């Protein structure tokens, strides 16, 4: 059993716990009282390696070998502030090559106020994947949490 520590961080009320619990428990949970736990390990065959993730859902570092930087893509602000969590993570390991993914959740609701090819953008310029999820229907979640494991294995 191979070990991934990841770390979940970003805004307030982006997604954070939902994509965790989502990854967790399979379920969606319309609210996650103040006082939830954030740490959660998991076992799960990646590409045919038994893995056992740490995962710390962060409050919207220095142990973490890769982060999910989330926004939720209703919310501009939280967009923006992934700069600040970028800035953080670069300062933390002294280094601009981190494993790292890019998360725009919330991907179920409509009229979006920040574009797939705004965050696709922001991406690139991290040289980090950008992908989009919902904790409420699953979609991308193991996509994100698989892929940060694959850019850790790359590094
Ligand atoms: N429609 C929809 N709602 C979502 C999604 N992800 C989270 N939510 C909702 O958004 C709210 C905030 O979710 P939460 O997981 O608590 O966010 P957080 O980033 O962990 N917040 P905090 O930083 O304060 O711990 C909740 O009402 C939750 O149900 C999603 O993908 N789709
Ligand atoms: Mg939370």
């Not at 103040?34 to 993730?53: A, M």
């Not at 209703?74 to 670069?90: A, G, L, M, P, V």
């Not at 980090?128 to 949490?145: C, L, M």
């Amino acid at each position: 059993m191979t070990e991934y520590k990841l770390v979940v961080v970003g805004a307030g009320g982006v997604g954070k716990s939902a994509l965790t619990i989502q990854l967790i428990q399979n379920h969606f949970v319309d609210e996650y009282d103040p006082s939830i736990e954030d740490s959660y390990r998991k076992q799960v065959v990646i590409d045919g390696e038994t893995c056992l993730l740490d995962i710390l859902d962060t409050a919207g570092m220095r142990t973490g070998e890769g982060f999910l930087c989330v926004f939720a893509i209703n919310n501009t602000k939280s967009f923006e502030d992934i700069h600040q969590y970028r800035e953080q993570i670069k300062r933390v390991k002294d280094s601009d090559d981190v494993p790292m993914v890019l998360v725009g959740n919330k991907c179920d609701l409509a009229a979006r106020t920040v574009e797939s090819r705004q965050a696709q953008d922001l991406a690139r310029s991290y040289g980090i994947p950008y992908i989009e999820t919902s904790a409420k229907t699953r979609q991308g979640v193991e996509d994100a949490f698989y892929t940060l494991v694959r850019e850790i294995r790359q590094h």
